[PDB]
Amino acid sequence: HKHAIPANIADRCLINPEQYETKYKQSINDPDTFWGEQGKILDWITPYQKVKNTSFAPGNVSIKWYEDGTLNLAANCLDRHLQENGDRTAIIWEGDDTSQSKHISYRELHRDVCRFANTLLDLGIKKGDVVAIYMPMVPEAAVAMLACARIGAVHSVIFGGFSPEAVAGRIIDSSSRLVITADEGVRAGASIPLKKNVDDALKNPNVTSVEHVIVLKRTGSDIDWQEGRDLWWRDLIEKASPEHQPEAMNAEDPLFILYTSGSTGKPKGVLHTTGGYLVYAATTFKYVFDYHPGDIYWCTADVGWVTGHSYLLYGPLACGATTLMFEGVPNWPTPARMCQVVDKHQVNILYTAPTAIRALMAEGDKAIEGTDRSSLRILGSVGEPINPEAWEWYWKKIGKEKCPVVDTWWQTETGGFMITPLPGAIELKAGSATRPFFGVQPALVDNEGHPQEGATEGNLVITDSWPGQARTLFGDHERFEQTYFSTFKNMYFSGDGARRDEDGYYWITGRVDDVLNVSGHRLGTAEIESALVAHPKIAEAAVVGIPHAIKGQAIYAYVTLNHGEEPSPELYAEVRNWVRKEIGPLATPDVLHWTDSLPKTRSGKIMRRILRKIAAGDTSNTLADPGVVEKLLEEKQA
Ligand SMILES: CCCOP(=O)(O)OC[C@H]1O[C@@H](n2cnc3c(N)ncnc32)[C@H](O)[C@@H]1O
């Protein structure tokens, strides 16, 4: 069943059903005219002439948009709003402790970004240098990111929940010259030891590139200090000039890297450039959230993830919006926190994740108790499939049956929304991402690469480029080709499956590759296997996901110990804590299945479908030793 577009949205919407159809058609039939005009959402220092210049061809994957144009992202997100909107709040910051908040005007944000841009330059950071940012959800994380972009440095934001080992790996791969961090993060009443984690990471002997660590005194806790290397945020910024002239960057200058888990190996740095990325971020934000001047917008995603890059910071600031940055979690101190934040700051647009929605739904009316929620006009969901029932609960309880829900499918590699409703254009189906965005040509293919027509299911590919597309993997364009453009030739393979219904609506069913989705976190099964195998007692490991009401998927690890070793309950917690140390809490296995019965072909291939099935609780429906299946079932029952 479809939800109709409500009258209030019809009355204000930037894109109606007719306009979506018209614009979508032009975007496909004439990308140069379409994106040529749409690119004017940004200010350009030297105008572009070329618009679309892309290829997905074998051996010739090359993605360029607006390539002869120049611009500055920070001028688009800050400077150009100053004359008329300097006094407008750019960032509302809400502390974990509600007694703590700030409204940061465009003018104040610009001033600090200029100070910090000069701070970076004075420290010897140059255009093209990579800067690691390992920060909690505080406004200074935004300042750091915007200052890096302003001077053309390439920020690489590392999610604050990653372990020292995970932080070291990212620093090593990117050759980061500087780490920006805080003494501690504050989340749900608890402290995260960020600087200490940096300290431990930098002790890795393979870290050779870091010259300084800039530290924000957030809590003022006791921390170790390395004289010469470590520098206090306040001491530097107070000394810095508030005057900084932005310089022209080429459209195709690198903007940021984000380490992203894949089907094979360890996370790789997904690279975005400047022009097409920002155009796409601004355009998707504006149209999908139907943003009007004055709308208070709140995306709940951490700055450490792509959603935080595109839809907490860059898209909203480019459009001159007020964006809310929340330090804490949607359910602390109480499940009603998210809606208390909504009421306190009169949020009109809320964009959150199914894991959060499921967590609040489990508490029922405790999630809305004593809250009003009337300021909301638009709801959004991102990061994982949303089951219809959760969708309906979100729509009914948070939106009060008054707000369109925009379920936005996309990925780190795509820069911005790819398949999504537009609230005044597209009638909603609970659990469906609905239609492709302007410039996006999706298709479904079988495992052999044959396009599947009509209402059908298959491997979800995108058959042409779009401005927000990631341009390479950091220092490895050949792997970029292999990973995304070799399975289905001349096509971008998302690694997701999807069904398309009779209306042409897409229903994304999840990864078809060996990538998990655990509480909205994208994780490779292979990286968890490597982390497990690095443990001195463990010989072999096979990791699969299982359905989980709360997390969406849980991590189920089949583990073979070195010959001579025997399991114990102490070993269970030891191995869990080991993975917590190797990667972080986000990757901790929910189940450890001690076995000597890993199911291998005669060649040595591990049969993963059976392990997936057994772990899910299936008892029904090539192997070197076929009697392993029986043993595995028995052990699963224990
Ligand atoms: C979009 C921000 C998260 O980016 P990441 O690159 O970390 O994760 C991308 C993957 O998350 C899932 N995913 C994301 N959005 C949806 C969605 N709306 N529905 C179903 N699955 C989704 C899809 O499987 C996708 O391949």
Side-chain angles (χ1 to χ4, degrees), residues 2-24 26-49 51-125 127-238 240-365 367-478 480-565 567-604 606-608 610-612 614-620 622-630 632-638:
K2 293 165 109 175
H3 289 264
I5 298 157
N8 69 304
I9 299 300
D11 285 354
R12 68 194 267 112
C13 65
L14 302 172
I15 309 298
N16 69 30
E18 296 61 46
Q19 294 171 310
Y20 166 83
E21 290 299 334
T22 308
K23 287 184 176 294
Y24 184 78
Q26 205 191 20
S27 73
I28 302 319
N29 291 346
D30 190 3
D32 279 344
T33 307
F34 182 85
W35 291 112
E37 287 169 7
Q38 193 48 227
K40 301 293 175 65
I41 195 168
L42 307 184
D43 289 2
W44 292 81
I45 295 156
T46 90
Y48 51 80
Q49 295 166 260
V51 174
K52 187 179 187 285
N53 184 12
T54 66
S55 182
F56 290 171
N60 290 277
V61 175
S62 179
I63 303 147
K64 290 185 193 187
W65 287 84
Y66 305 118
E67 78 192 72
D68 51 359
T70 71
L71 81 162
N72 195 101
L73 173 146
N76 274 279
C77 288
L78 308 165
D79 303 53
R80 69 174 181 156
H81 309 299
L82 291 184
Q83 186 179 287
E84 299 300 304
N85 288 108
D87 297 334
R88 178 185 291 164
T89 308
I91 297 169
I92 297 169
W93 178 76
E94 168 79 1
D96 185 57
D97 180 350
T98 190
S99 73
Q100 296 189 329
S101 61
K102 291 177 177 201
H103 286 64
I104 303 151
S105 69
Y106 272 92
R107 193 179 296 106
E108 182 193 337
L109 183 56
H110 171 263
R111 189 165 198 81
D112 276 348
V113 168
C114 286
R115 290 205 293 177
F116 204 67
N118 287 325
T119 296
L120 294 168
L121 293 165
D122 282 356
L123 226 37
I125 300 307
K127 185 180 174 176
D129 295 347
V130 185
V131 177
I133 303 170
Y134 185 61
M135 286 282 273
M137 285 283 272
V138 293
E140 292 86 355
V143 172
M145 291 171 73
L146 292 158
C148 288
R150 197 179 181 83
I151 72 179
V154 178
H155 68 67
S156 174
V157 184
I158 303 161
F159 169 68
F162 277 121
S163 72
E165 190 74 34
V167 167
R170 288 156 177 79
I171 287 168
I172 292 162
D173 189 83
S174 66
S175 287
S176 301
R177 279 197 56 191
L178 173 81
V179 180
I180 305 173
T181 193
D183 54 8
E184 296 183 308
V186 173
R187 202 167 156 283
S191 292
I192 306 310
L194 293 172
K195 161 71 157 74
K196 197 189 176 60
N197 283 1
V198 173
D199 282 354
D200 290 347
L202 298 194
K203 281 161 175 173
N204 187 307
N206 298 293
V207 176
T208 58
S209 57
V210 173
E211 284 149 43
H212 294 289
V213 182
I214 290 167
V215 189
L216 179 66
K217 195 177 275 150
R218 166 66 185 89
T219 61
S221 283
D222 269 21
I223 60 164
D224 306 310
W225 198 253
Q226 188 167 308
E227 219 65 62
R229 182 194 77 182
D230 295 341
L231 304 162
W232 288 113
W233 178 285
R234 187 180 158 83
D235 291 349
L236 295 171
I237 204 160
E238 284 313 298
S241 174
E243 312 288 290
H244 180 276
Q245 306 302 113
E247 265 153 27
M249 309 299 155
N250 188 263
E252 292 297 341
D253 282 342
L255 176 73
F256 69 83
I257 312 294
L258 256 186
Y259 288 84
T260 303
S261 293
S263 199
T264 80
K266 296 176 102 155
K268 301 305 202 311
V270 175
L271 187 151
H272 288 277
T273 58
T274 307
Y277 168 85
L278 192 53
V279 169
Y280 201 75
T283 300
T284 53
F285 169 87
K286 185 157 130 187
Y287 292 148
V288 166
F289 293 120
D290 198 47
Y291 163 82
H292 290 64
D295 288 346
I296 307 299
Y297 168 82
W298 183 24
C299 167
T300 68
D302 200 276
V303 76
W305 309 122
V306 69
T307 306
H309 286 42
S310 298
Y311 301 105
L312 189 303
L313 288 167
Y314 295 140
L317 293 177
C319 294
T322 302
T323 188
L324 197 156
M325 187 190 308
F326 176 46
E327 191 186 38
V329 297
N331 58 187
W332 191 91
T334 75
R337 186 68 187 283
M338 185 182 80
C339 295
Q340 291 163 168
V341 179
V342 167
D343 285 350
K344 179 178 175 195
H345 301 292
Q346 295 288 105
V347 174
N348 306 118
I349 309 158
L350 176 68
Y351 185 41
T352 194
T355 297
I357 298 163
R358 287 192 307 268
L360 299 181
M361 185 177 37
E363 310 307 315
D365 284 356
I368 62 161
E369 177 182 287
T371 75
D372 182 286
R373 295 147 288 129
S374 307
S375 62
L376 289 169
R377 281 184 291 263
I378 303 284
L379 296 177
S381 175
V382 61
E384 28 181 329
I386 186 166
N387 113 277
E389 294 177 336
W391 192 106
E392 289 291 345
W393 184 94
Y394 186 45
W395 180 81
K396 170 179 187 191
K397 297 293 180 165
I398 312 302
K400 297 167 75 186
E401 317 187 20
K402 292 176 162 169
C403 306
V405 175
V406 293
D407 180 9
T408 61
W409 176 85
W410 60 296
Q411 319 177 285
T412 309
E413 297 91 337
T414 79
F417 306 154
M418 295 293 286
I419 298 177
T420 182
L422 277 63
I426 292 159
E427 301 188 305
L428 311 173
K429 298 185 192 188
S432 181
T434 78
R435 298 206 182 278
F437 193 73
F438 309 135
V440 178
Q441 310 186 58
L444 302 176
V445 296
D446 61 17
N447 288 335
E448 293 70 41
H450 307 141
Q452 302 302 113
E453 309 294 20
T456 188
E457 72 200 325
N459 302 298
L460 175 53
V461 297
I462 314 290
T463 63
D464 209 340
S465 194
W466 60 97
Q469 190 170 7
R471 308 301 212 248
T472 190
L473 295 171
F474 179 78
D476 211 340
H477 190 80
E478 286 188 32
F480 179 74
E481 301 195 338
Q482 292 181 78
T483 305
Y484 304 103
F485 300 94
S486 73
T487 311
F488 304 114
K489 305 291 176 190
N490 253 295
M491 285 170 272
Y492 170 81
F493 181 33
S494 70
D496 282 314
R499 95 177 153 284
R500 187 178 51 235
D501 67 23
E502 298 77 9
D503 286 317
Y505 280 43
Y506 288 86
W507 305 72
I508 286 75
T509 44
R511 303 298 296 216
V512 291
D513 54 5
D514 292 302
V515 170
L516 298 195
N517 195 322
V518 191
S519 307
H521 300 123
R522 178 172 160 177
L523 290 166
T525 52
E527 71 190 295
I528 304 173
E529 289 169 6
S530 299
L532 289 162
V533 168
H535 188 280
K537 285 184 176 79
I538 295 179
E540 225 153 5
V543 173
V544 298
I546 59 164
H548 190 102
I550 282 311
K551 314 194 190 201
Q553 273 190 312
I555 298 163
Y556 189 113
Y558 293 86
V559 174
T560 304
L561 301 173
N562 293 325
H563 279 242
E565 295 294 331
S568 51
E570 293 188 5
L571 194 55
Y572 214 97
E574 178 182 332
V575 170
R576 298 220 322 158
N577 281 334
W578 180 263
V579 176
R580 216 153 158 105
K581 177 204 169 181
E582 283 294 285
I583 304 171
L586 78 169
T588 322
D590 304 284
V591 175
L592 295 167
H593 183 132
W594 315 115
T595 195
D596 296 313
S597 302
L598 280 178
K600 287 175 187 163
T601 66
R602 289 170 189 84
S603 77
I606 184 266
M607 281 190 67
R608 291 195 128 261
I610 176 74
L611 295 178
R612 212 168 300 117
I614 290 175
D618 301 357
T619 312
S620 301
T622 271
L623 281 176
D625 188 21
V628 296
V629 178
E630 181 75 296
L632 288 166
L633 285 166
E634 281 173 6
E635 296 165 354
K636 209 274 166 183
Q637 277 288 299

